[PDB]
DNA sequence: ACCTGCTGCGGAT
């Protein structure tokens with residue numbers, strides 16, 4: 088049993104002098120990779136998955152022309168960190184080679200991202216590196232230019248953090264780029280995927296390899312986390328101060344000053360800039376200084392120069408704290424970071440495991456992680472998150488099926504340089520995972536829209552007698568300036584693409600002391616998943632029924648600290664005192680009260696996430712304007728639905744038959760604000776909207792105007808591929824209709840209770856749903 | 860009172 092016996096003597100001798108022994112994930116991965124199989128490596132953050140995917144390819148490059156290895160990272164910071172960390176093995180091979188009198192190998196390593204200056208991009212095409220590190224977006228650019236000629240020799244493709252794109256149109260974008268690559272090679276490259284958070288393994292492996300078989304490497308995972316949920320104030324409902332931020336910022340500086348290097352994660356860029364300002368202002372007042380800053384920001388809007396210095400000073404431990412977004416969530420190996428702080432509950436359990444994983448990033452080390460709730464109901468969010476992280480209960484991922492807009496974009500790009508065979512392009516598309524069942528009718532339908540069908544611009548010419556697609560002038564410049572799959576989002580700061588007479592684009596689509604509508608806020612993308620929503624209610628119900636003893640025991644195995652136990656107990660007690668019972672996975676609560684203006688307000692309490700409450704609000708809305716004649720559309724969130732009715736009220740308003748749900752949602756989604764937004768993002772991603780400058784993505788006000796003016800014409804044609812895909816994304820990717828159906832099935836089974844209660848003043852849970 | 864998510868981002872003249 089020798090995992091290093093396969094490699095040459097030099098690489099074997101180096102790895103022995105560098106590490107005590109390979110990890111199980113390395114030994115298994117080297118076996119599968121060396122035998123030629125596509126391999127998905129599933130192991131915790133301290134497992135050495137980088138060398139698992141790289142070392143065999145490195146050994147072959149060391150053995151006595153063109154880019155040979157292609158590493159793809161979803162994050163730029165990780166891409167640069169991999170380049171720096173590959174210096175240790177390459178430097179070691181050289182030391183060992185020369186120790187034994189052999190000539191040193193020359194292995195080049197390059198990084199191609201958006202930060203690469205033009206002159207360096209030209210140097211990387213004239214002299215391509217043996218190991219190319221890049222992003223999915225940039226891989227798309229090289230495949231849609233003369234740079235692809237350097238990729239004709241690629242033998243290995245590493246897709247790091249494959250879970251981060253598997254369930255998105257960004258990964259479908261990546262899935263097609265890789266198939267376009269395989270068509271540039273004599274032999275499709277070997278594909279290797281890495282992730283500590285894979286569920287289900289078989290589906291992520293299907294995303295990585297498409298139709299090719301995948302050896303799944305997933306050895307027994309032992310990763311120790313030291314998690315903690317700290318609440319600095321004794322009562323979040325009655326704060327001595329204007330806000331909870333001052334006491335939170337205090338404990339963070341306390342935690343940073345107590346640890347060598349810490350990463351503080353914020354769920355937005357503005358909050359990261361804010362906290363960095365606060366943490367420095369606190370550190371200065373404590374140290375009599377007006378002298379390095381204690382903390383510095385890292386996120387997408389930071390320049391590359393400042394970003395580079397933050398990563399370098401973090402790599403060396405010079406920087407004691409960095410306040411980052413998800414730009415540092417994955418992969419980075421900062422040996423000086425022994426603490427990760429998460430402000431607010433993270434967007435998912437998997438991300439919390441990835442973020443906290445940055446700390447203790449060595450084999451066998453513990454990852455220390457502290458979560459700070461922002462408000463009362465966020466404390467439950469952080470607790471459930473810590474709970475699921477300790478048991479590894481992450482979300483189940485599902486590859487979006489047949490995303491036609493992603494296809495249309497690649498179709499312009501694959502034919503931007505040459506004429507492509509429609510059959511061959513279809514054959515390659517079906518080899519990817521997201522299009523394995525693509526109907527040929529949908530394929531030709533997409534080509535028709537790109538060619539011939541007038542507020543849009545077609546970008547290709549289709550010869551059906553020959554089966555050939557050719558590009559119209561500027562197709563390449565259109566594809567390369569597209570930006571990929573990530574959509575242009577933006578908020579109406581008052582009004583842009585105005586309607587005068589900050590707000591969410593969807594809230595805006597639904598346009599002194601008089602009753603007002605509550606601004607609907609979609610944080611970003613889909614919302615809470617149904618399985619995690621169930622876990623939230625089961626946590627709330629369980630802990631709201633424990634004597635203080637079992638309660639305290641339960642909180643301490645989550646790492647509750649400060650006053651987290653007091654505030655959770657008080658929160659559930661007060662919610663119990665207000666509605667008798669607390670909402671849970673088995674009991675929904677319908678709460679009713681009258682506004683100070685005399686208007687009724689009926690709130691549905693349920694933890695099952697926005698993916699279920701989104702479509703449920705559509706159904707309630709249809710009934711409200713049909714059965715009651717009220718056109719005000721209800722506000723939906725992760726933790727329930729808010730309805731407002733002028734004074735004339737029941738819970739049967741929310742209850743529907745299981746077979747009634749899916750048809751209703753299908754009929755209402757076409758007029759909803761979500762569909763208008765996702766039709767715009769789809770139309771732009773398909774490269775069909777007219778832009779203001781050929782080599783520049785049109786401003787958001789202009790996308791909206793042209794997309795809205797296009798939809799008013801496309802509504803007339805229900806078979807329009809953009810309409811089809813917009814409906815496809817809303818119902819399958821945003822909503823979770825199967826979850827909404829079984830929820831109604833359970834309510835019909837009398838297995839999900841419902842309680843009507845009238846309150847004199849909003850309960851704690853109702854107060855939270857009202858703007859906070 | 861939390862004061863309303865991120866990721867990435869031309870090329871050929």
Ligand SMILES: *O[C@@H]1[C@H](O)[C@@H](COP(=O)(O)OP(=O)(O)NP(=O)(O)O)O[C@H]1n1cnc2c(N)ncnc21
Pocket residue numbers: 106107108109110113130131132133134135136137138172282283417418419420444448449450
């Ligand atoms: O060189 C590595 C690094 O310093 C850490 C962890 O290695 P990673 O390659 O970053 O492991 P992961 O990619 O899985 N981390 P994440 O899931 O991306 O977050 O340990 C070093 N290292 C590698 N291999 C070993 C062995 N065998 N022993 C000790 N340290 C090792």
Ligand SMILES: [Mg+2]
Pocket residue numbers: 136137247248281282418
């Ligand atoms: Mg990794």
